[PDB]
């Protein structure tokens, strides 16, 4: 959707030719932030509409400065699928063998 | 703990000895072990061939990384080279850790 503001008044319209791009990091080549317990999950209640959280990451620092070992990542440097309205995305994943959680 | 690859069955020990060569024994029998030997030593060549398996870097890091280098600046000697007297030396310890990975 496209948002135009004239004076203190916004108009929302569809942009039919705009695209969204999506990829999975399957080779685990990015800093992995899902293992820290963050907001931005899918809501527990199915009727709630949620905002997607912004991706960011940390690398090595000394104070506020960075060292030469610090790494910068461009997410554009991955291949990703582009989607207009009418395109969909899917993938499958296999969990590796993990012990049963003990629910007793 | 000093570093490297721990193994239950490491490369085996390779033991070498010059076999003793007696000097002239007496002409009457004596039961004592012979303590008199020909002075002797050996020389040769050794080859050791090791095959090493490598694990390549897959990184998506954008910026260039730290690498081990020689320094261009002029010096009396070349590092990791022979001396003017013929003495090879290793000027610095070199570890393996230059490339980076995510944690």
Summarize the structure.
The structure is cut from a larger assembly and holds 2 copies of chain A. With 104 residues, chain A is an all-beta fold. Chain A has no helices and 4 strands.
What does this structure look like?
This is part of a larger assembly, with two copies of chain A. Chain A is mainly beta and 104 residues long. Chain A is extended, with a radius of gyration of 20 Å. The relative contact order of chain A is 0.21. Helix content of chain A is 0%, strand content 13%. Chain A contains no helices and four strands. A two-stranded antiparallel ribbon of chain A has the order 1-2. Chain A has strands at 2-5, 10-13, 20-22, 81-83. At the A-B interface, loops of A face loops of B. The PDB classes it as virus like particle. Keywords: adeno-associated virus, pH, phospholipase-A2, capsid, gene therapy, AAV9, dependoparvovirus, intracellular trafficking, endosome, virus like particle, galactose, glycan attachment. Structure of the adeno-associated virus 9 capsid at pH pH 7.4 in complex with terminal galactose.
Keywords:
part of a larger assembly; 2 chains; two-stranded antiparallel sheet; Capsid protein VP1 (chain A)
Helix-strand layout with pairing:
The structure is cut from a larger assembly and holds two copies of chain A.
Chain A: E1 2-5, E2 10-13, E3 20-22, E4 81-83
Antiparallel strand pairs in A: 1-2, 3-4
PDB class: virus like particle
Keywords: adeno-associated virus, pH, phospholipase-A2, capsid, gene therapy, AAV9, dependoparvovirus, intracellular trafficking, endosome, virus like particle, galactose, glycan attachment
Entry title: Structure of the adeno-associated virus 9 capsid at pH pH 7.4 in complex with terminal galactose
């Amino acid at each position: 959707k496209e948002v135009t503001d004239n004076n203190g008044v916004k108009t929302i319209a569809n942009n039919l030719t705009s695209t969204v791009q999506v990829f999975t990091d399957s080779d685990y080549q990015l800093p992995y932030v899902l293992g820290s317990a963050h907001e931005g999950c899918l809501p527990p209640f199915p009727a709630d509409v949620f905002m997607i959280p912004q991706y960011g990451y940390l690398t090595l620092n000394d104070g506020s400065q960075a060292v030469g070992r610090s790494s910068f990542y461009c997410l554009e440097y991955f291949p990703s699928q582009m989607l207009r309205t009418g395109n969909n995305f899917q993938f499958s994943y296999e969990f590796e063998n993990v012990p049963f959680h003990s629910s007793y | 703990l000093m570093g490297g690859f721990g193994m239950k069955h490491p490369p085996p020990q390779i033991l070498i000895k010059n076999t003793p060569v007696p000097a002239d024994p007496p002409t009457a029998f004596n039961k004592d072990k012979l303590n008199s030997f020909i002075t002797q030593y050996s020389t040769g060549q050794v080859s050791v061939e090791i095959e090493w398996e490598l694990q390549k870097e897959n990184s998506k890091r954008w910026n260039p990384e730290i690498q081990y280098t020689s320094n261009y600046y002029k010096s009396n000697n070349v590092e990791f080279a022979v001396n003017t007297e013929g003495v090879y030396s290793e000027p610095r310890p070199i570890g393996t850790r230059y490339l980076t990975r995510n944690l």
